[PDB]
Design a protein around this ligand. Structure first.
Ligand SMILES: Cc1cc2nc3c(=O)[nH]c(=O)nc-3n(C[C@H](O)[C@H](O)[C@H](O)COP(=O)(O)O)c2cc1C
Length: 441
């Protein structure tokens, strides 16, 4: 209370430590609001692509949310409007609950990697091996195991980390054990880091030695032939890449198991309707029975032709994207919306098709990135914890920065999802629309 984290050797019982306070108030609001929306997007999403990976992401989202709600207490201590009672107790609990959560996410990242490893190495075996029962067992085990590797903090085995250095009591009253540090390294950091390292090494080496012929389907609806030209343009672009393309007219296809077999599905539709958004006549039946196509888990993307003079430029691309999202499709890229003549927009269509080919690996890239940013944000804390448990270097400012740089990973996951996952961005947009509906009613 007399000290200050970035206080630079000065002691004054007066200071409110505003710089540290605002940095913490800012990180509390960003960790809560960011993960609240991730959780609400899941709540509104009817079906998912990558059900198990999404379940570990939702667990990480709750873990990160609980960090922010848990970060109200040290923020309350910095404002000290009401500091409650028993600061040392308050501090111990806070340091623990924020140590178990950084581990819950540590294991969810280890499990998502194993999940993707299994989906690649044993693809036929995967669906019997990774089951809802084993997944629920696995997540309950991550919450139980996390509480146990940090439980000796309450049974005089020493302090488990600097998550409590914020409160004055843990800076003076608490001291870390190199035995406790060595035990939690061999039970959390070393095993979870090894798992992630091992799995990603294998999965990325497999993505090299694939040589697997990629089969893509295009289904277009055109009443004047523009989406058909755009489809044909897209097809030639994918064929040039190496794809086995089947471009079919929507009026010639039956909905039943239509997407089955294909690694990529592009859906084209022009927009129609006199004072309405209506789908192209040939697509209307395909859209109404899109359920039967096998859209779940499917890497899909949309494109269409429209006229910008219309209130909803390519409103069909919007309707199709919304249903595909709701059937558990992975929308790998924001839809291509062609204004007037597509023959004039060939460079756009080629560019979009080029990008959609690089958008397939996007789901693996985000998981690897979510993990890569996690380890480089908690690596400083574990190497500072590694040393200061052995007492090699002891700094309150380095403790604050490493601690809150690790506490900062909690708001990073939602910004990676928001600026990389096209299905997520779409779920986020529709969530906003529902908030304005509650606002009206
Ligand atoms: C009745 C009517 C409604 C239309 N509504 C829209 C619209 O809401 N949004 C849009 O972008 N284009 C709209 N258009 C323009 C068509 O989407 C455009 O002509 C398109 O290039 C047709 O492509 P197709 O050849 O693949 O049918 C409309 C055209 C008609 C005749």
């Amino acid at each position: 209370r007399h000290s200050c984290p970035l206080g630079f050797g000065h002691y004054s019982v007066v200071d409110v430590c505003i710089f540290e306070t605002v940095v913490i108030v800012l990180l509390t609001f960003l960790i809560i609001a960011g993960n609240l929306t991730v959780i609400f997007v899941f709540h509104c999403a009817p079906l998912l692509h990558h059900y198990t990976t999404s379940y570990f992401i939702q667990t990480m989202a709750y873990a990160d949310l609980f960090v922010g709600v848990s970060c109200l207490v040290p923020t309350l201590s910095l404002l000290h409007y009401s500091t409650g009672v028993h600061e040392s107790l308050t501090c111990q609990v806070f340091g623990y609950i924020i140590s178990v959560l950084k581990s819950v996410s540590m294991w969810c990242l280890a499990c998502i990697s194993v999940d993707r490893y299994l989906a690649i190495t044993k693809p036929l075996s995967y669906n019997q091996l990774v089951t809802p029962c084993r997944l629920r067992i696995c997540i309950i085990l991550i919450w139980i195991y996390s509480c146990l590797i940090f439980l000796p903090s309450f049974f005089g085995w020493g302090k488990p980390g600097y998550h409590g250095d914020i409160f004055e009591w843990c800076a003076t009253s608490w001291l870390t054990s190199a035995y406790f540090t060595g035990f939690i390294v061999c039970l959390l950091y070393a095993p979870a880091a090894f798992v992630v390292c091992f799995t990603y090494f294998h999965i990325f080496k497999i993505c090299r030695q694939h040589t697997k012929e990629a089969k893509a389907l295009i289904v277009y609806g055109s009443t004047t032939g523009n989406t058909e030209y755009t489809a044909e343009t897209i097809a030639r672009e994918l064929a040039d890449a190496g794809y086995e393309v089947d471009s079919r007219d929507a009026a010639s296809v039956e909905a039943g198991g239509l997407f089955e077999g294909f690694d990529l599905v592009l859906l084209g539709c022009s927009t129609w309707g006199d004072d309405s958004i209506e789908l192209q006549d040939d697509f209307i039946p395909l859209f109404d029975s899109l359920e039967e196509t096998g859209a779940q888990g499917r890497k899909v993307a949309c494109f269409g032709c429209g006229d910008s003079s219309w209130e909803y430029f390519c409103g069909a691309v919007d309707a199709i994207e919304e249903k595909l999202k709701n059937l558990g499709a992975e929308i790998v890229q924001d839809g291509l919306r062609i204004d007037g003549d597509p023959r004039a927009a060939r460079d756009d269509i080629v560019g979009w098709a080029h990008d959609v080919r690089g958008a397939i690996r996007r789901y693996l890239m985000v998981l690897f990135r979510i993990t890569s940013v996690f380890y480089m944000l908690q690596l400083p804390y574990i190497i500072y914890f590694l040393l200061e448990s052995s007492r090699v270097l002891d700094n309150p400012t380095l403790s604050f920065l490493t601690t809150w740089l690790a506490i900062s990973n909690s708001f990073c996951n939602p910004v990676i999802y928001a600026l990389s996952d096209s299905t997520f961005r779409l779920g986020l947009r529709r969530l906003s629309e529902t908030m304005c509906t509650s606002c009206m009613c």
